[PDB]
Design a protein around this ligand. Structure first.
Ligand SMILES: *[C@@H]1O[C@H](CO)[C@@H](O[C@@H]2O[C@H](CO)[C@@H](O[C@@H]3O[C@H](CO)[C@@H](O)[C@H](O)[C@@H]3O)[C@H](O)[C@H]2NC(C)=O)[C@H](O)[C@H]1NC(C)=O
Ligand SMILES: *[C@@H]1O[C@H](CO)[C@@H](O)[C@H](O)[C@H]1NC(C)=O
Ligand SMILES: *[C@@H]1O[C@H](CO)[C@@H](O)[C@H](O)[C@H]1NC(C)=O
Ligand SMILES: *[C@@H]1O[C@H](CO)[C@@H](O)[C@H](O)[C@H]1NC(C)=O
Ligand SMILES: *[C@@H]1O[C@H](CO)[C@@H](O)[C@H](O)[C@H]1NC(C)=O
Ligand SMILES: *[C@@H]1O[C@H](CO)[C@@H](O)[C@H](O)[C@H]1NC(C)=O
Ligand SMILES: [Ca+2]
Ligand SMILES: [Ca+2]
Ligand SMILES: [Ca+2]
Ligand SMILES: [Ca+2]
Ligand SMILES: [Ca+2]
Ligand SMILES: [Ca+2]
Ligand SMILES: [Ca+2]
Ligand SMILES: [Ca+2]
Ligand SMILES: [Ca+2]
Ligand SMILES: [Ca+2]
Ligand SMILES: [Ca+2]
Ligand SMILES: [Ca+2]
Lengths: 275, 48, 271, 271
């Protein structure tokens, strides 16, 4: 009950000062998320310790820097648990992974509120532009069937799964947007892949997605009309992972000056599960 | 069985009421208005 | 146009969204590969109903298949009122995609060229030559004040500088100020001298594939981003169409109605 | 409609003929026998050049051939901004010719009819049922309030009272206020419940044959010779077309712009 209604009065003259303190941990924690390809190319295994030593001179105490290895973009998109405070995610760009990278960026860079979806028993809808559905698991073959006012499937027969429309097939992660205001019947392989009704709150500003490779393709906003460039949608140019990591360490002061530690959650899950 | 009848409708009969209005007086419509017509009284005298 | 005097304390009039939905037509131009992936044919009707939920009348939406980018590039006719052009990106079609986008997104006042006889300059920065047909091959030869070619014998076509070949569409710009002799394959391709007017706000182009590459402005220095050049990632054409339908409010808000006194009759799909 | 206040002393404006000719389009619908007797096919170009002299720009005139009156009656789309329908008359085509003239000259507001389920009435004097298709054979059966047909058995279709047979187009009026059950060949012919609004300013019908026989209004009493029901005698289609061309000022003067906020999108040949 932090009194989020009474106004706060500032002043436009006095004074530029310091931030006093905050006592819940000794200090912040930086947190790299790199693919296995970095380790394989580096061909080492004292390199995490070397990078910690090289962070120490930049001014991070030893215990603050953590490293997390993931198989690749698609295998990491499933339940991306950001166990940490200042998250960087080095995403190697690869052609045909454009929408997968956009999915992961839209998932972690923004703060989501997800409810369960019991597909077998209910139809489902979308409240507004801010409401997506997020399907995750080993294999998500999300076949939808929209229904008119009369509960007759338009372009599909509700009793014949074949007639359905496959919005996204065989994805580790799929953010699906169907038209807002029309009931749908969903069908996906509930043994492997789960699905959730996820509304989009404001942005999550612990996380910085560093596109390691090509052009600027991360379209976080599903709206085709908008395509903003966020300060955390980082992009760097690479030939070698050692060069990438060295740039990160060298410029880490700016990397954390663009983010903000405040927007953090108890659980490491990338969304608030509101049941 | 029976073809009991056909029955006039609003569309056929509103012109009949238009042509029926002009016979209506006014010195005793006031008396009829003053008398309180209940569910019994209004439909008591339909075509006998 | 006369001056339009107006206040600054006028009150905001009511929203015209319902009126534009009720008295306009939306115009979806999609590639045939979309339909092939969809593997359906009640899908036009289903999308029309899903548009009806958003507000368009039952007939207000017109779907137009086209073969592919170049086949739509040759003679782009937009038979309707609020135009969306789905435009898939694949590599090596960057320039032709940009040419098509420029042609549909800018108005052109333009007239034919009799290549067999005359020599044609270019008036200025906003004066191109648009060549369209089954197979265009512009071969230009610049001249001098003495009407002698430079880097090109006026007779021998072999010395001409080809600046397009096998293109279904070519927006060719040359040095503005020189008389050029052109050879172009008269049978299977036409060329017309065109001048660039203001934007054709009727249209908007949704690039379905990779990064921003559309450069409508031939000028190297300026590469502006226009509200009407949308870009949306994709893996499934159902997802693309569903996003378009869901955000059709915003696309139409981006797109403004045409305003240009056309002197040439053509078929439109109006209400 | 909001009031509009105007004086009675303001000076008359200038002639708007040039502006309307530059901004509008004219379109002629003629039978195939016209081209057959012309025995030509440069004649569309010839007549367009002829219209240009009176002041219709080159693309503004559209010649839309139709096979014949009865086959044209089905789904008449008038793809234009000023419509002329040349209409040859032969005896025994009187009623169908009058039907088509009524259909296009009078504005309509139509809704679908579901013959299979509902019993349908007629709202009043301005309401009709229009059936269009390759072959319409409507068979109606009136009912009581107890759903016992008069002069027909509601279950047996033979007893039904046929009101039109094997007609491409049929505008049927029936007794207003009595429920009817209909039987019309749902695969072939589509029937719609329409109300006759005011007139259509856009279309003029040039009867080419015989007496002033058209009766647009189903009411027996009124047979008013509206101005857009023009008529002309003929022996040569060339003479007919020259007459129309020479007097095209009078014809478009008789017609006028269409003023209705439509709700059914369709192709138009506007400029
Ligand atoms: C209005 O009246 C006509 C007059 O008959 C109706 O024609 C009937 O149409 C139905 C189907 O539309 C025919 O049914 C057929 O039944 C046989 C079995 O006997 C079956 O083998 C066929 O596949 C078909 O289902 C029926 O035979 C036909 N009447 C006659 C005398 O042949 C018309 O259907 C009526 N319109 C409506 C909308 O009901
Ligand atoms: C604020 O931080 C700076 C860091 O350079 C420090 O020098 C300064 O003393 C701090 N403010 C005060 C009032 O001490
Ligand atoms: C999903 O579809 C498969 C086959 O298309 C079907 O066996 C399965 O029952 C469906 N899922 C649900 C929850 O009905
Ligand atoms: C005027 O604006 C209000 C917004 O609350 C809307 O409900 C109403 O329909 C508008 N008027 C018209 C004629 O649409
Ligand atoms: C262009 O050159 C070719 C090759 O000689 C020739 O066949 C063709 O007629 C030329 N076209 C024009 C328009 O000069
Ligand atoms: C109307 O006609 C008169 C007489 O020919 C002419 O003087 C005047 O300029 C015309 N008005 C316009 C607006 O052309
Ligand atoms: Ca995906
Ligand atoms: Ca389907
Ligand atoms: Ca949505
Ligand atoms: Ca976007
Ligand atoms: Ca091209
Ligand atoms: Ca040369
Ligand atoms: Ca130029
Ligand atoms: Ca440029
Ligand atoms: Ca009978
Ligand atoms: Ca008829
Ligand atoms: Ca009637
Ligand atoms: Ca009459």
């Amino acid at each position: 009950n932090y009194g989020l209604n009474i106004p706060i009065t500032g002043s436009m003259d006095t004074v530029y000062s310091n931030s006093t303190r905050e006592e819940v941990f000794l200090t912040s924690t930086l947190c790299l998320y790199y693919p296995t390809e970095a380790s394989t190319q580096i061909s080492d295994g004292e390199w995490k310790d070397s990078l910690s030593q090289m962070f120490l001179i930049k001014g991070w105490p030893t215990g603050s820097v953590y490293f997390k290895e993931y198989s690749n973009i698609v295998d990491f998109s499933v339940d991306p648990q950001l166990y940490c405070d200042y998250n960087l995610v080095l995403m190697k760009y690869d052609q045909s992974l454009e929408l997968d990278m956009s999915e992961l960026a839209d998932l972690i860079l923004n703060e989501w509120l997800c409810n369960p979806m019991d597909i077998t028993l209910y139809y489902y809808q979308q409240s507004g532009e801010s409401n997506k559905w997020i399907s995750m698991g080993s294999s998500c073959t999300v076949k939808v069937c929209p229904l008119n006012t009369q509960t007759l499937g338009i372009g599909c027969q509700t009793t014949n799964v074949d007639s359905f429309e496959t919005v996204a097939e065989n994805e580790k992660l799929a953010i699906v947007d169907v038209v807002d205001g029309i009931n749908h019947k969903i069908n996906l392989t509930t043994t492997t892949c789960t699905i959730r009704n996820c509304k989009k709150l404001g942005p999550r500003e612990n996380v910085a997605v560093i596109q390691v490779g090509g052009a600027n393709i991360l379209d976080i906003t599903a709206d085709p009309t908008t395509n903003p460039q966020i300060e955390r949608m980082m992009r760097v140019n690479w030939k070698r992972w050692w060069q990438v990591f060295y740039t990160i360490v060298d410029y880490i002061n700016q990397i954390v000056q663009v983010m903000s530690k405040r927007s953090r959650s108890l659980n490491s899950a990338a969304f608030y599960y509101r049941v | 069985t029976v073809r009991q009848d056909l029955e006039r409708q609003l569309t056929n009969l509103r012109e009949e009421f238009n042509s029926l209005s002009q016979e209506i007086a006014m010195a005793q419509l006031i008396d009829l208005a003053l008398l309180p017509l209940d569910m019994f009284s209004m439909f008591s005298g339909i075509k006998s």
